[PDB]
mmCIF file of C-alpha atoms in Angstrom:
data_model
loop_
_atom_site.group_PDB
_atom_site.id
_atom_site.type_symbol
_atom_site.label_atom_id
_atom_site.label_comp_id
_atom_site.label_asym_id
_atom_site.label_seq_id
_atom_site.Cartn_x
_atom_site.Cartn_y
_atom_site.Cartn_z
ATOM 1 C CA UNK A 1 6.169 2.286 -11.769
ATOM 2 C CA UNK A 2 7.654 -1.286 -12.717
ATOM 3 C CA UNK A 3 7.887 -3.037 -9.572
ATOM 4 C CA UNK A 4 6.961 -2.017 -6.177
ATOM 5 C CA UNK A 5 7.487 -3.512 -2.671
ATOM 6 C CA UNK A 6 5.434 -2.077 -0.108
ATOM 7 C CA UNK A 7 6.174 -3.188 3.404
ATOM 8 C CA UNK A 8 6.322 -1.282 6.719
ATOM 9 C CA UNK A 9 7.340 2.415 5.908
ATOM 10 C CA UNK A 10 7.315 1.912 2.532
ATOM 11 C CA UNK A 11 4.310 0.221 2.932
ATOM 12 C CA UNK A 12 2.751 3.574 3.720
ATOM 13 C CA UNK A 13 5.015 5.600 1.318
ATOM 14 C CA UNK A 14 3.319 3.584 -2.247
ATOM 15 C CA UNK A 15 0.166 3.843 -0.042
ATOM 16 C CA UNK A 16 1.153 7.323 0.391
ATOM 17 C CA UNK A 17 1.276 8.397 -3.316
ATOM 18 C CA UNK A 18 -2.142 6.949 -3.786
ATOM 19 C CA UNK A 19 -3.882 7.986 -0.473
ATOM 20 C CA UNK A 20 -2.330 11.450 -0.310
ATOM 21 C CA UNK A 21 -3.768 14.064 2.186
ATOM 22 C CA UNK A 22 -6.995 11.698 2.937
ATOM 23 C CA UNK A 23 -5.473 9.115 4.900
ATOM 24 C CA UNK A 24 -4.638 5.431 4.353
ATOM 25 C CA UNK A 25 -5.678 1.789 5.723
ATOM 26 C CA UNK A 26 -1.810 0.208 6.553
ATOM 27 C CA UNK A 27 -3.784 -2.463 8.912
ATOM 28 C CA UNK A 28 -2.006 -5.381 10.111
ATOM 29 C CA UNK A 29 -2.712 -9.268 8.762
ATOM 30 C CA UNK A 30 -2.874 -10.763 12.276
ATOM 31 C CA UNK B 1 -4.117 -7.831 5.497
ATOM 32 C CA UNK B 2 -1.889 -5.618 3.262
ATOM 33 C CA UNK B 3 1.100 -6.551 5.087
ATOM 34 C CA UNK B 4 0.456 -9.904 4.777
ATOM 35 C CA UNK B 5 0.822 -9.650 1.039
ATOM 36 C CA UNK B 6 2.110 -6.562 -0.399
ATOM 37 C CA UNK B 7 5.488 -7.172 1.923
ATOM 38 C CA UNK B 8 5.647 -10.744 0.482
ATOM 39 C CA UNK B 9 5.760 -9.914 -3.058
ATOM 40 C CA UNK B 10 5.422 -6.584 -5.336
ATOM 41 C CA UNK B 11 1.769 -5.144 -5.679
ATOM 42 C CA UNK B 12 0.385 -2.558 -8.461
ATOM 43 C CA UNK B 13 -0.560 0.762 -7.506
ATOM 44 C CA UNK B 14 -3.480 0.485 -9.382
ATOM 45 C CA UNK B 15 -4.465 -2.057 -6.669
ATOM 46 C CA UNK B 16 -2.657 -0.377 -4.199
ATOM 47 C CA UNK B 17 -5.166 2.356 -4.074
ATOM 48 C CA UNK B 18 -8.215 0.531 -3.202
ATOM 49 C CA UNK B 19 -6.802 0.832 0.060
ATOM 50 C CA UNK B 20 -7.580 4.515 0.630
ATOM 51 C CA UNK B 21 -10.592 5.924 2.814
#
């Protein structure tokens, strides 16, 4: 963990990782 | 707004979780 871009799926995938089996946020800006 | 930031530049997981339920 050094550097990580989160953005669409991978977006989800680091918010994966954290979130896990309880769901994440992923809203959009606007 | 986590698109409109975290796909702009890198974030930290550590913050990166706050965005759980």
């Amino acid at each position: 963990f050094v550097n990580q871009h989160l953005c669409g799926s991978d977006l989800v995938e680091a918010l994966y990782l954290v979130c896990g089996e309880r769901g994440f946020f992923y809203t959009k800006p606007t | 707004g986590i698109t409109e930031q975290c796909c702009t530049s890198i974030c930290s997981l550590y913050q990166l979780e706050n965005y759980c339920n």
